[PDB]
Amino acid sequence: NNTLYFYNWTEYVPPGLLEQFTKETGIKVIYSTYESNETMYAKLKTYKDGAYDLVVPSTYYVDKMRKEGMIQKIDKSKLTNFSNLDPDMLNKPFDPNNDYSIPYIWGATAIGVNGDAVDPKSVTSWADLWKPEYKGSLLLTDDAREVFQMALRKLGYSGNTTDPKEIEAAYNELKKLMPNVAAFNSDNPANPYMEGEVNLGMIWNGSAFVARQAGTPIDVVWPKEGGIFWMDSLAIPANAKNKEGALKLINFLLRPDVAKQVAETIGYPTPNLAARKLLSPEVANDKTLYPDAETIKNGEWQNDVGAASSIYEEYYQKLKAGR
Amino acid sequence: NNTLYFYNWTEYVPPGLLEQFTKETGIKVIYSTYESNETMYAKLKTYKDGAYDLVVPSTYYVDKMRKEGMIQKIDKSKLTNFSNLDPDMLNKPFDPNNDYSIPYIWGATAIGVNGDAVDPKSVTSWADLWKPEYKGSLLLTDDAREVFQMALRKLGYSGNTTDPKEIEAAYNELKKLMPNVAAFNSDNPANPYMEGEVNLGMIWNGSAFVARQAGTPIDVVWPKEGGIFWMDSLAIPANAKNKEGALKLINFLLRPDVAKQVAETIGYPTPNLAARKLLSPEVANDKTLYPDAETIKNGEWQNDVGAASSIYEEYYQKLKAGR
């Protein structure tokens, strides 16, 4: 109607996007960002000046906040641009008939490397990251689940365990890694690499792309044990003050030209097909951004772990603090 | 030759600028960034994997690292575009006849408020930041000189004092403010505001521009006591391994269509007069980016403080350490 409140992660919407939206509709969206689901979640339980109308939970946080009654059903009929999303993303259990989420952006977390510092050939697995040769040199994504997933995998047990013994093992493994961990980053992963601070460590693919386009020889080596895969979906907070307005914005974002427009800039893969077709060849050919099913089947997707999410979060906090 | 190693500040080169330089000239340039002259200088006294060919120190560090033999004389004649810069930026004492520096990008630090949360009319002076009404809620820039300048300008004597007496006062006063400091930031001062971590504090004009363009309503109030004005300059390390290629980059950033192209992306005002005339109206007319002569009158450019610099630095570290 008048204003709109869009809470979203850090590097997803570039300048000019929302302005575009406002020209067409005349609805001015006040933009707010975050670096973590957990941060978004908690802020949605306690703050106004966080964001209200449109938020972006990650996929494994959708059923949790739905059964928690934090998000309302979405009127798909209002989303005339829905047919543009490819169904390989729309038969997911966390939301069977896609009623509380719309696939927004997706991507992966691999290993990142400055090729002008480290020959990427040296790095083949998550396990390498633990080598002493990396004392005080890695950047780790500040995401409890990715961090844990990476040790879990390296162990053999993996990604979305529910068995706290296995998770506990992952924890103890991480303790061994911390000495090598020089920084944590869920804002712009790539930056610590550009500022020389780090050489290798974890990184979001959409990120290494903007650094690479920026000038920093940063390769995304897919780790031998997987490649952390994830999808962020839009959602309306149960008591947004402008639902009909969120629908316009969720729909604006489903227009393939918009999607396409943003994907080329941000790197992060789009779960919209029409757009993906018109993807400039250069960006599409990119195997780090659009990995082949050869790799993604050896990769794992980040899913809901249930009441076991308490355990992950708690050990991660311990992991950061003790250190 | 084959490669170039450019060390510059965090948000100055937009993705695509150097890859464009390489297209024309064929010179591959490896990008590396930094957040401070102090870091840059530090690095410049030790790192191969720091940055060698083209570097961007501040106006105030040019005589400092000149007389250290850190940077070498630039061949003006090879910079055909030198005539585009304005004669009101190339007259300064620190470099009488621009033999060591080349005006690249300039700008300023002021007060930034999320209009949406804080009533901009409520703020008006660096002194207002000290009001305990703002506990643990201010963003301060990670620069010794700027942080101290805000203070000096508070208590009168200011900016480039070389008299340790006034500098000591500066410090004490900063302690008397530190309990209000939420965060320090010299990567992108706008970010913490976006993330809703702070609603006000000091901010660089280019950041707030890109934030407002992004979607975050961030006002920049020019402070009563003044408003820190600064200018960044390209220079060539006394012993870069590709001096001539660097001459090419300098000359490239000097071409107006390249100066304008970026100046609208990042907001920070260009010193190249040629492009300023081609400046898109909205950006040219933006009061916050090209502070009217009056604001720049009550303002103060950060100048070299000579040997007294050590004091500034040393005591800033301490203050950071204290809290």
XYZ file of C-alpha atoms in Angstrom:
646
model
C 0.000 0.000 0.000
C 2.311 2.707 1.308
C 5.553 1.241 2.639
C 6.791 -2.308 2.804
C 9.333 -3.978 5.028
C 11.713 -6.398 3.360
C 14.208 -8.284 5.571
C 16.727 -10.133 3.545
C 20.282 -11.358 3.706
C 23.298 -9.197 2.851
C 24.227 -9.648 -0.836
C 20.949 -10.633 -2.479
C 19.331 -7.373 -3.746
C 21.620 -4.809 -5.358
C 20.913 -1.085 -5.533
C 18.210 -0.050 -7.997
C 16.085 -3.211 -7.641
C 13.609 -1.985 -5.056
C 13.604 1.445 -6.710
C 12.524 -0.323 -9.897
C 9.711 -2.024 -7.947
C 8.633 1.334 -6.479
C 8.374 2.921 -9.903
C 6.060 0.236 -11.214
C 3.897 -0.098 -8.090
C 4.559 3.092 -6.244
C 5.102 0.994 -3.088
C 8.269 2.074 -1.321
C 10.040 -0.796 0.489
C 12.321 0.097 3.454
C 15.167 -2.467 3.229
C 16.882 -4.299 6.150
C 19.464 -7.107 6.004
C 20.806 -10.074 8.059
C 23.560 -12.708 7.872
C 21.827 -15.605 9.523
C 18.597 -17.526 9.770
C 19.033 -17.790 13.531
C 19.525 -14.004 13.688
C 16.502 -13.450 11.462
C 14.390 -15.926 13.414
C 15.110 -14.423 16.862
C 14.721 -10.877 15.529
C 11.314 -11.875 14.189
C 10.251 -12.949 17.601
C 11.259 -9.708 19.256
C 11.674 -6.706 16.935
C 9.818 -4.173 14.842
C 12.842 -2.452 13.331
C 14.029 -5.858 12.094
C 11.542 -6.250 9.229
C 7.865 -7.130 8.872
C 6.348 -7.770 5.438
C 8.693 -9.953 3.525
C 11.451 -12.122 4.922
C 13.711 -14.859 3.509
C 13.979 -17.985 5.724
C 16.299 -20.680 4.473
C 14.491 -23.801 3.423
C 15.284 -25.866 6.546
C 13.707 -23.041 8.589
C 10.370 -23.007 6.762
C 8.428 -25.796 8.547
C 9.846 -24.670 11.907
C 8.535 -21.130 11.538
C 5.258 -22.433 10.013
C 4.337 -24.884 12.765
C 5.614 -22.045 15.046
C 2.974 -19.843 13.338
C 5.480 -17.153 12.296
C 4.422 -17.182 8.675
C 1.023 -17.286 7.019
C -0.095 -19.049 3.822
C 0.711 -17.168 0.621
C -1.973 -16.600 -2.043
C -0.330 -18.336 -5.014
C -3.095 -17.086 -7.327
C -1.713 -13.577 -6.722
C 1.705 -14.828 -7.908
C 1.061 -14.795 -11.630
C 4.850 -15.203 -12.164
C 4.903 -18.599 -10.277
C 5.071 -20.946 -13.376
C 8.569 -19.493 -13.951
C 10.106 -21.473 -11.046
C 11.389 -24.903 -12.062
C 9.508 -27.843 -10.332
C 12.738 -29.602 -9.360
C 12.454 -27.166 -6.427
C 8.712 -27.471 -5.770
C 7.888 -30.917 -4.347
C 9.828 -30.447 -1.185
C 8.416 -31.974 2.034
C 9.067 -28.919 4.236
C 6.346 -27.305 2.113
C 4.617 -29.981 -0.108
C 2.202 -27.683 -1.998
C 4.436 -24.624 -1.626
C 2.079 -22.638 0.599
C 4.389 -20.731 2.984
C 7.481 -20.222 0.841
C 8.470 -19.229 -2.716
C 11.973 -20.295 -3.860
C 13.952 -17.057 -3.875
C 17.670 -17.680 -4.297
C 19.843 -20.743 -3.911
C 23.486 -21.668 -3.934
C 26.257 -23.618 -2.304
C 29.187 -23.425 0.030
C 32.454 -24.857 -1.216
C 36.100 -24.189 -0.546
C 37.393 -20.812 -1.761
C 41.019 -20.110 -2.725
C 43.148 -17.231 -3.904
C 44.883 -18.779 -6.893
C 47.585 -16.086 -6.746
C 48.480 -17.331 -3.249
C 47.555 -20.968 -3.068
C 47.579 -23.252 -6.040
C 44.027 -24.664 -5.796
C 45.311 -28.017 -6.966
C 46.656 -28.368 -3.400
C 43.048 -28.444 -2.079
C 40.807 -31.407 -2.856
C 38.727 -31.912 0.423
C 37.149 -30.315 3.512
C 39.552 -32.514 5.384
C 42.583 -30.619 3.947
C 41.300 -27.540 5.796
C 42.477 -29.145 9.045
C 46.152 -29.348 8.021
C 48.529 -27.493 10.360
C 49.913 -25.781 7.210
C 46.705 -23.732 7.661
C 47.417 -22.472 11.194
C 45.800 -19.089 11.622
C 44.684 -18.812 7.977
C 41.129 -19.913 7.230
C 37.864 -18.024 7.046
C 34.820 -20.068 8.027
C 31.267 -19.189 7.152
C 29.532 -17.949 10.344
C 26.752 -20.508 9.927
C 26.379 -23.212 12.594
C 24.848 -25.652 10.108
C 27.358 -25.247 7.308
C 30.278 -25.381 9.752
C 28.881 -28.470 11.351
C 27.903 -30.044 8.040
C 31.528 -29.685 6.842
C 32.946 -31.639 9.859
C 30.122 -34.099 9.837
C 30.902 -34.924 6.216
C 34.683 -35.142 6.784
C 33.774 -37.648 9.548
C 31.519 -39.835 7.388
C 28.328 -39.245 9.334
C 26.661 -36.252 7.690
C 24.869 -33.013 6.954
C 21.530 -33.452 8.591
C 22.090 -36.047 11.339
C 19.706 -36.124 14.252
C 21.973 -38.450 16.302
C 23.676 -36.202 18.893
C 26.577 -38.665 19.243
C 27.522 -38.037 15.607
C 27.029 -34.273 16.066
C 29.111 -34.358 19.258
C 31.860 -36.042 17.156
C 31.617 -33.284 14.595
C 31.961 -30.829 17.431
C 35.076 -32.418 18.805
C 36.474 -32.447 15.251
C 35.781 -28.693 14.869
C 37.678 -27.977 18.085
C 40.655 -29.424 16.273
C 40.065 -26.998 13.393
C 39.614 -23.806 15.421
C 43.285 -23.190 15.796
C 43.374 -22.785 11.974
C 40.211 -20.655 11.866
C 41.188 -16.987 11.509
C 37.745 -15.451 10.888
C 34.027 -16.056 10.529
C 31.877 -14.370 7.892
C 28.256 -14.496 6.821
C 28.097 -10.943 5.477
C 30.415 -11.034 2.504
C 32.593 -14.278 2.777
C 34.774 -13.137 -0.141
C 36.043 -9.914 1.491
C 38.546 -11.485 3.964
C 40.111 -13.026 0.866
C 40.319 -9.705 -1.036
C 41.836 -7.917 1.962
C 44.609 -10.489 2.064
C 43.575 -11.669 5.509
C 42.801 -15.189 4.343
C 43.856 -17.408 1.418
C 41.587 -20.418 1.619
C 38.680 -21.542 3.862
C 34.925 -21.746 3.265
C 32.997 -19.452 0.956
C 29.568 -18.920 -0.581
C 29.755 -19.408 -4.371
C 27.668 -16.382 -5.186
C 30.333 -14.478 -3.206
C 33.544 -15.758 -4.816
C 31.913 -14.660 -8.092
C 31.615 -10.996 -7.149
C 35.189 -11.053 -5.868
C 36.374 -12.700 -9.080
C 34.467 -10.178 -11.189
C 36.106 -7.620 -8.873
C 39.694 -8.851 -9.428
C 40.544 -11.371 -6.736
C 41.802 -14.771 -8.111
C 39.390 -16.697 -6.012
C 38.553 -20.213 -6.994
C 35.725 -22.325 -5.645
C 37.127 -25.886 -5.393
C 34.330 -28.375 -4.851
C 35.299 -30.458 -1.836
C 35.707 -34.209 -2.298
C 33.095 -34.921 0.433
C 30.241 -32.848 -0.861
C 29.540 -29.189 -1.396
C 26.985 -27.694 0.978
C 23.792 -26.949 -1.003
C 21.096 -24.465 0.118
C 17.952 -22.573 -0.935
C 16.461 -19.368 0.509
C 12.716 -18.838 0.151
C 10.504 -15.795 0.635
C 7.717 -15.726 3.174
C 5.245 -13.305 4.703
C 5.402 -12.847 8.499
C 2.186 -14.074 10.133
C 1.236 -10.525 11.010
C 2.753 -8.357 8.318
C 1.006 -5.004 7.984
C 1.112 -5.160 4.157
C 0.493 -8.631 2.822
C -1.040 -7.553 -0.489
C 2.132 -5.493 -0.945
C 4.424 -8.322 -0.121
C 2.645 -10.317 -2.839
C 3.488 -7.652 -5.397
C 7.167 -7.770 -4.339
C 7.250 -11.612 -4.226
C 5.746 -11.466 -7.734
C 8.095 -8.770 -8.987
C 10.889 -11.122 -7.947
C 9.325 -13.976 -9.916
C 9.494 -12.030 -13.228
C 12.281 -13.816 -15.160
C 13.866 -10.643 -16.487
C 14.238 -9.325 -12.905
C 15.522 -12.663 -11.663
C 17.895 -12.864 -14.645
C 18.947 -9.211 -14.062
C 19.959 -9.954 -10.435
C 21.524 -13.407 -10.968
C 24.061 -12.037 -13.469
C 25.111 -9.457 -10.883
C 25.043 -11.555 -7.714
C 26.196 -14.912 -8.956
C 23.892 -16.882 -6.709
C 21.903 -19.370 -8.883
C 18.205 -18.659 -9.567
C 15.511 -21.220 -8.942
C 13.591 -19.593 -11.788
C 13.706 -21.428 -15.144
C 12.531 -18.854 -17.718
C 15.328 -16.608 -16.527
C 17.947 -19.335 -16.264
C 17.459 -19.908 -19.996
C 18.271 -16.332 -20.891
C 21.274 -16.443 -18.551
C 24.206 -14.903 -20.319
C 26.350 -17.901 -21.442
C 29.342 -16.780 -19.312
C 27.432 -16.991 -16.043
C 25.625 -20.245 -17.018
C 28.782 -22.002 -18.136
C 30.185 -21.251 -14.696
C 30.448 -24.682 -12.956
C 30.933 -23.114 -9.536
C 27.658 -21.219 -9.897
C 25.688 -23.725 -11.938
C 27.306 -27.033 -10.909
C 26.597 -30.194 -12.902
C 24.382 -32.878 -11.349
C 27.593 -34.911 -11.268
C 28.760 -32.763 -8.403
C 25.465 -31.908 -6.769
C 24.602 -35.588 -6.270
C 27.861 -35.905 -4.407
C 26.828 -32.719 -2.625
C 24.278 -32.614 0.209
C 21.299 -30.205 0.686
C 20.768 -28.454 4.001
C 17.633 -29.746 5.662
C 15.559 -29.289 8.814
C 17.011 -31.385 11.673
C 14.083 -30.912 13.996
C 14.386 -30.503 17.723
C 18.004 -31.376 17.065
C 18.536 -27.794 15.842
C 18.948 -26.846 19.553
C 22.070 -29.083 19.711
C 23.685 -27.634 16.586
C 23.169 -24.016 17.604
C 24.340 -24.639 21.205
C 27.585 -26.427 20.207
C 28.333 -23.732 17.599
C 28.043 -21.013 20.158
C 30.320 -23.028 22.498
C 32.708 -23.482 19.578
C 32.982 -19.733 18.923
C 33.157 -18.530 22.550
C 35.596 -20.962 24.073
C 38.009 -20.237 21.251
C 53.326 -6.429 -18.793
C 51.409 -9.565 -17.955
C 50.148 -8.587 -14.485
C 49.538 -5.625 -12.200
C 48.996 -5.677 -8.418
C 46.561 -2.904 -7.308
C 46.048 -2.259 -3.584
C 43.077 -0.009 -2.956
C 40.241 0.705 -0.502
C 37.297 -1.665 -0.024
C 34.328 -0.199 -2.031
C 36.115 1.906 -4.723
C 36.317 -0.344 -7.755
C 32.988 -1.767 -8.899
C 32.943 -5.257 -10.399
C 33.918 -4.905 -14.077
C 36.273 -1.926 -14.076
C 39.615 -3.668 -14.171
C 38.401 -6.506 -16.374
C 37.623 -3.608 -18.768
C 41.149 -2.194 -18.393
C 42.570 -5.623 -19.243
C 40.352 -5.734 -22.417
C 41.945 -2.579 -23.842
C 45.540 -2.822 -22.558
C 45.889 -6.584 -22.068
C 47.276 -6.093 -18.567
C 45.953 -8.603 -16.033
C 45.414 -6.877 -12.711
C 45.131 -8.833 -9.407
C 42.869 -6.948 -6.989
C 43.619 -6.567 -3.237
C 41.871 -4.214 -0.869
C 42.339 -2.588 2.519
C 40.484 -0.380 5.056
C 43.172 1.925 6.315
C 46.357 3.815 5.396
C 47.780 2.412 8.570
C 47.216 -1.154 7.348
C 48.295 -0.230 3.859
C 51.487 1.378 5.210
C 52.117 -1.501 7.588
C 51.673 -3.964 4.757
C 53.860 -1.801 2.491
C 56.702 -2.306 4.994
C 56.419 -6.117 4.798
C 54.147 -7.825 2.183
C 54.756 -9.352 -1.189
C 51.261 -10.755 -0.716
C 50.240 -7.248 0.353
C 50.418 -5.127 -2.809
C 53.162 -3.880 -5.120
C 52.313 -1.891 -8.240
C 49.650 0.774 -7.746
C 48.581 1.864 -4.233
C 46.087 4.491 -2.966
C 47.259 6.390 0.145
C 45.489 9.389 1.607
C 46.604 12.971 0.953
C 47.992 13.055 4.505
C 50.252 10.004 4.022
C 51.880 11.112 0.796
C 54.657 13.251 2.341
C 54.989 10.658 5.075
C 55.723 7.774 2.756
C 57.436 10.042 0.251
C 60.260 10.950 2.567
C 60.592 7.306 3.536
C 61.288 6.521 -0.135
C 58.202 4.313 -0.172
C 56.644 5.685 -3.281
C 58.459 6.863 -6.413
C 58.008 9.793 -8.878
C 55.217 9.343 -11.389
C 55.904 10.239 -15.027
C 53.237 12.898 -15.545
C 53.835 12.981 -19.258
C 52.618 9.405 -19.583
C 49.308 10.383 -17.998
C 47.774 12.116 -21.016
C 44.479 12.542 -19.037
C 46.030 14.444 -16.144
C 44.358 17.598 -17.529
C 40.901 16.367 -16.496
C 41.441 16.782 -12.757
C 40.453 20.172 -11.373
C 43.167 22.817 -10.508
C 41.598 23.232 -7.041
C 42.690 19.679 -6.085
C 46.266 19.781 -7.377
C 47.828 22.652 -5.484
C 48.445 21.216 -2.061
C 51.691 21.492 -0.053
C 52.052 17.706 0.524
C 52.880 17.494 -3.165
C 53.650 20.975 -4.652
C 53.831 19.731 -8.210
C 52.121 16.268 -8.000
C 55.268 14.268 -8.472
C 54.236 11.604 -6.002
C 50.427 11.537 -5.986
C 47.505 11.598 -8.440
C 44.042 12.691 -7.126
C 41.842 9.585 -7.486
C 38.744 9.853 -5.305
C 37.895 12.185 -2.468
C 35.059 12.379 -0.003
C 33.983 12.973 3.619
C 32.820 11.590 6.969
C 29.815 13.006 8.744
C 26.895 11.775 10.844
C 24.521 9.135 9.427
C 21.041 8.410 10.775
C 18.482 5.795 9.664
C 15.758 8.390 9.044
C 13.243 5.576 9.443
C 14.371 4.932 13.065
C 15.971 8.172 14.353
C 14.639 11.668 13.754
C 17.514 13.334 11.828
C 16.456 16.706 13.174
C 17.498 15.443 16.662
C 21.192 15.265 15.734
C 23.308 18.253 14.827
C 26.844 17.949 16.189
C 29.604 15.466 16.955
C 28.868 16.546 20.488
C 25.346 15.098 20.168
C 26.973 11.672 19.853
C 28.211 11.950 23.419
C 24.722 12.298 24.871
C 24.312 9.170 27.088
C 20.861 9.002 25.522
C 22.806 6.942 22.809
C 24.408 4.142 24.870
C 26.145 1.248 23.131
C 24.472 2.421 19.935
C 26.883 4.301 17.681
C 28.918 3.296 14.682
C 32.376 4.795 14.686
C 34.715 4.687 11.738
C 37.845 2.576 12.165
C 40.173 5.492 11.408
C 42.459 7.049 14.066
C 42.481 10.508 12.455
C 38.725 10.679 11.795
C 37.693 9.350 15.189
C 40.104 11.874 16.815
C 39.015 14.683 14.488
C 35.415 14.362 15.524
C 36.690 14.805 19.085
C 39.163 17.660 18.519
C 36.462 19.517 16.612
C 34.276 18.837 19.656
C 36.588 20.552 22.140
C 37.704 23.279 19.753
C 41.411 22.828 18.742
C 41.317 20.306 16.021
C 41.894 18.131 13.024
C 45.591 18.142 12.343
C 46.954 19.221 15.726
C 50.585 18.292 16.160
C 50.526 19.616 19.827
C 50.256 16.476 22.028
C 48.421 18.492 24.666
C 45.313 18.802 22.567
C 45.764 15.232 21.358
C 45.696 13.919 25.026
C 42.474 15.783 25.614
C 41.192 14.236 22.402
C 41.773 10.762 23.802
C 40.248 11.269 27.279
C 37.127 12.663 25.628
C 36.981 9.538 23.406
C 36.869 7.351 26.518
C 33.978 9.526 27.644
C 32.209 8.323 24.480
C 33.331 4.733 24.029
C 30.526 3.332 26.170
C 28.189 4.499 23.346
C 30.177 2.722 20.604
C 28.306 -0.245 19.235
C 30.868 -0.930 16.466
C 33.914 0.323 14.574
C 33.860 -0.054 10.810
C 36.082 0.812 7.832
C 34.971 -1.769 5.281
C 31.606 -0.244 4.534
C 30.192 2.044 7.268
C 26.660 1.675 5.806
C 26.409 -2.034 6.409
C 25.846 -2.054 10.271
C 23.107 0.520 9.697
C 21.436 -1.720 7.103
C 21.618 -4.683 9.478
C 19.924 -2.471 12.018
C 22.769 -2.844 14.476
C 23.154 0.935 14.841
C 20.759 3.747 13.870
C 23.389 6.472 13.835
C 27.027 7.438 14.242
C 29.707 8.550 11.805
C 29.460 7.561 8.145
C 31.289 8.000 4.842
C 29.190 9.765 2.194
C 29.635 7.185 -0.575
C 28.413 4.333 1.668
C 25.234 6.083 2.703
C 24.596 6.807 -0.964
C 24.818 3.172 -1.993
C 22.703 2.287 1.072
C 19.951 4.764 0.168
C 20.183 3.477 -3.376
C 20.021 -0.028 -1.885
C 16.904 0.632 0.134
C 18.181 1.690 3.570
C 17.037 5.311 4.365
C 20.291 6.726 5.671
C 20.544 10.428 6.162
C 23.848 12.207 6.328
C 23.786 15.275 8.533
C 26.687 17.646 8.178
C 27.894 18.360 11.734
C 27.826 21.879 13.247
C 31.420 21.728 14.436
C 32.442 20.765 10.868
C 32.711 17.479 8.946
C 35.945 15.624 8.105
C 36.983 16.084 4.482
C 39.465 13.708 2.863
C 41.016 12.806 -0.530
C 42.613 9.556 -1.711
C 45.567 9.476 -4.141
C 47.188 6.894 -6.484
C 50.901 6.329 -6.099
C 53.516 3.874 -7.279
C 55.622 2.013 -4.722
C 59.291 2.974 -5.035
C 59.817 -0.413 -6.352
C 56.799 -1.828 -8.162
C 57.595 -4.470 -10.723
C 55.412 -2.935 -13.442
C 55.703 0.828 -13.169
C 54.591 1.450 -16.778
C 51.452 -0.715 -16.564
C 50.551 1.191 -13.426
C 50.951 4.394 -15.499
C 48.279 2.845 -17.726
C 45.809 2.156 -14.892
C 46.298 5.661 -13.469
C 45.648 7.063 -16.896
C 42.651 4.771 -17.282
C 40.979 5.869 -13.990
C 41.774 9.329 -15.272
C 39.567 8.949 -18.374
C 36.243 10.813 -17.601
C 33.893 8.068 -18.881
C 35.631 5.754 -16.407
C 35.610 8.389 -13.676
C 31.894 9.168 -14.229
C 30.950 5.486 -14.721
C 32.185 4.664 -11.174
C 31.337 8.030 -9.511
C 27.675 7.216 -9.971
C 28.082 3.599 -8.844
C 29.912 4.307 -5.553
C 28.720 7.853 -4.873
C 32.100 9.176 -3.683
C 32.957 12.451 -5.526
C 35.645 12.269 -8.279
C 38.504 14.865 -8.447
C 38.457 14.601 -12.257
C 36.613 17.782 -13.287
C 35.896 16.509 -16.808
C 33.469 13.776 -15.673
C 31.923 15.853 -12.850
C 30.353 17.875 -15.702
C 28.960 14.697 -17.232
C 27.645 13.694 -13.797
C 24.092 12.400 -13.837
C 21.932 15.222 -12.390
C 20.517 13.349 -9.395
C 24.059 12.404 -8.310
C 25.570 15.843 -9.153
C 22.833 17.689 -7.339
C 23.085 15.393 -4.281
C 23.935 17.748 -1.408
C 25.579 14.968 0.647
C 28.064 13.922 -2.030
C 29.123 17.437 -3.265
C 28.869 19.434 -0.001
C 28.236 23.038 -0.988
C 31.248 25.326 -0.646
C 29.779 26.564 2.609
C 29.715 23.143 4.305
C 33.255 22.573 3.000
C 34.110 25.962 4.506
C 33.127 25.041 8.080
C 34.712 21.719 7.219
C 38.279 20.532 7.629
C 40.476 18.410 5.404
C 42.690 15.870 7.149
C 46.302 17.031 6.721
C 49.659 15.530 7.617
C 50.491 15.951 11.297
C 54.113 14.923 10.824
C 55.917 13.172 13.719
C 52.896 13.831 15.904
C 51.072 11.178 13.936
C 52.581 8.445 16.069
C 50.755 9.885 19.067
C 47.417 9.832 17.229
C 47.897 6.254 16.156
C 49.285 4.936 19.417
C 46.499 6.433 21.538
C 43.753 5.219 19.163
C 44.947 1.657 19.481
C 44.883 2.068 23.278
C 41.307 3.430 23.305
C 40.216 0.553 21.086
C 42.089 -1.688 23.532
C 40.503 -0.169 26.645
C 36.796 -0.802 25.906
